[PDB]
Each structure stands twice: as C-alpha cells, then as structure tokens.
Amino acid sequence: TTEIHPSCVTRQKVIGGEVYKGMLKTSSGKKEVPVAIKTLKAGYTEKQRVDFLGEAGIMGQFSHHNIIRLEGVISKYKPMMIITEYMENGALDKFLREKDGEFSVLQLVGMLRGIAAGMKYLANMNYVHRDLAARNILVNSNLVCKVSDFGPIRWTAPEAISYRKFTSASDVWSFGIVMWEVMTYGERPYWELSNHEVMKAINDGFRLPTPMDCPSAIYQLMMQCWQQERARRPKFADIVSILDKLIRAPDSLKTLADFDPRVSIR
Numbered sequence: 388t389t390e391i392h393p394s395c396v397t398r399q400k401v402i403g404g405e406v407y408k409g410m411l412k413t414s415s416g417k418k419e420v421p422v423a424i425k426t427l428k429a430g431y432t433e434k435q436r437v438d439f440l441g442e443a444g445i446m447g448q449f450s451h452h453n454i455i456r457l458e459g460v461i462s463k464y465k466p467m468m469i470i471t472e473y474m475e476n477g478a479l480d481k482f483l484r485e486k487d488g489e490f491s492v493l494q495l496v497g498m499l500r501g502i503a504a505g506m507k508y509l510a511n512m513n514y515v516h517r518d519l520a521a522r523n524i525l526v527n528s529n530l531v532c533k534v535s536d537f538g539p540i541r542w543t544a545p546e547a548i549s550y551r552k553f554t555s556a557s558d559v560w561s562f563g564i565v566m567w568e569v570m571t572y573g574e575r576p577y578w579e580l581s582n583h584e585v586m587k588a589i590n591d592g593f594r595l596p597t598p599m600d601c602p603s604a605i606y607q608l609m610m611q612c613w614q615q616e617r618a619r620r621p622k623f624a625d626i627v628s629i630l631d632k633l634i635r636a637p638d639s640l641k642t643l644a645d646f647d648p649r650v651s652i653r
C-alpha cells in the first residue's frame with residue numbers, strides 16, 4: 388500500500404468521516420487522476436483505525452478489472468485518508484434506480500458478468516466478502532461494475548444467518564440476490580417483508596420471483612445460487628462461464644422466464 392503525501396491530494400467536492408471526489412498527483416508529478424477520498428475524523432477509536440486501514444490493506448492485495456483500484460493511503464498525517472479510483476456513476480443499486488428500464492438485457496447481463504468475475508477473483512484469493520449486495524458495487528462512466536466496499540439478513544445465505552458459516556458458497560447466495568437486484572433495476576429484495584418474514588419464507592423454500600423481462604437462463608442461474616444445500620450451489624467459476632456463454636450466444640437470452648402476473652387487469 389502506497390503512502391501518499393498530502394501535497395498530492397486535493398478535495399474538490401463532498402460525495403457522502405466523509406467521502407470526497409478529488410484529484411491525485413501521481414508518477415512523480417507527471418500524471419493527475421480523479422479519485423475518491425474517504426476520511427477518518429479525529430477522535431476515531433483503535434477499532435475504527437483497525438477497520439479503516441484494514442479495508443485499505445485488503446483492497447491493496449487485489450488487482451482485477453472488477454475490483455476497485457486502491458491508489459494509496461494517508462496514514463502518517465491526519466485526518467487519515469483512503470484514496471481509490473473515482474467511479475463516476477456511484478453505487479450500483481442507486482444507479483439502476485435512477486436508470487429504471489433504460490438498459491438492455493445484454494447490458495444488465497454484462498454488469499453481472501463483471502461482478503461475478505470480481506467475486507471469482509476474491510474467492511480464489513481466499514477472501515469471503517460476507518456483505519455482497521449491489522450497494523457495495525460501484526459503477527464507472529463506461530458501465531463497468533466493480534466490487535468496492537470491503538469493510539443484512541436478506542442478502543445472506545441460510546447457513547451464514549444461523550451458524551455464522553460464511554464461505555464463498557454463502558457469497559454465491561448473495562450474488563444470486565445481486566442478480567435479482569440488477570435485473571429489477573434495484574428493487575428491494577423481498578419487498579416489504581421484515582427480516583423475520585424473509586427467514587420464514589426462505590426456510591419454507593420460497594424464493595424471489597422472476598424479474599420482468601428476465602432471460603429464463605438468468606433466472607435459472609439465480610435460483611441455483613439459492614440452493615438450500617451450499618454444496619449444490621454453483622461456484623463463481625461456473626457463474627462466470629455460464630454468463631460468458633450466454634453473452635456469446637445472445638439469442639439464448641431471448642427465451643424469457645414467465646413474469647408472474649401479481650395483479651389482475653382485464
């Protein structure tokens with residue numbers, strides 16, 4: 388992890404300590420790139436410092452197209468900062484809710500292929516995410532999706548809820564929920580159900596119904612991610628491979644799962 392000198396970082400705008408959009412001077416002054424800047428305000432506890440720099444240390448181990456790029460940290464000066472590439476379109480769930488209906492099926496499936504490639508990378512590096520959800524995916528100006536936040540019941544596999552057994556296979560369950568979030572343009576999984584009602588339905592065998600305009604193969608794949616027995620779930624390698632095969636033979640995506648008419652209109 389590169390230690391960045393504060394003279395190289397400018398904060399321009401507040402995004403969301405705080406998160407800033409800013410600029411970073413790199414390569415001995417020869418380049419300048421847009422960045423996101425996350426700060427940790429004075430008064431932070433030892434636990435907060437450990438989680439804060441721990442997320443940067445984890446981010447710093449990864450080098451993959453679909454994982455957010457860490458530029459470096461400012462730890463020797465206060466307030467401390469983590470500095471990443473700037474993702475122009477923000478979080479995936481909020482982005483899709485702003486763009487409802489505006490993308491093609493092929494584009495949505497492409498976003499999922501990217502997320503899945505990022506997760507396959509993570510899982511193969513022996514990292515379990517445990518909080519995989521569209522809110523933790525960021526989107527850049529080219530619609531590339533990247534697993535981004537590394538530091539809730541309705542994304543979590545049953546065995547992880549009840550036994551705290553978090554594995555790559557419980558991340559696959561979460562990825563299935565992310566598939567449903569993407570294909571619905573950011574709907575809330577299980578809608579109005581409370582957490583206890585979500586647990587009730589899942590453990591009874593209920594699963595989220597098909598999104599509108601959803602390829603049958605995509606709904607089949609998310610349903611397989613939600614197998615109760617974790618051993619029956621696809622591996623991330625299977626998911627990437629299937630999505631790749633669908634994108635390369637895109638008429639395969641024209642066969643839609645039936646969208647269940649929840650409402651009677653005659």
Ligand SMILES: Cc1cccc(Cl)c1NC(=O)c1cnc(Nc2cccc(C(=O)NC3CC(C)(C)N(O)C(C)(C)C3)c2)s1
Pocket residue numbers: 402403406423424425442455469470471472473474475476477478482485525535536537
């Ligand atoms: C992920 C992460 C972990 C630790 C440390 C850091 Cl620094 C980071 N990096 C980040 O949090 C971020 C990197 N890039 C980010 N981009 C970002 C985040 C939130 C909002 C936006 C943003 O510009 N959103 C706009 C919001 C509006 C203006 C409403 N429109 O419509 C669009 C342009 C579509 C999206 C961008 S956050």
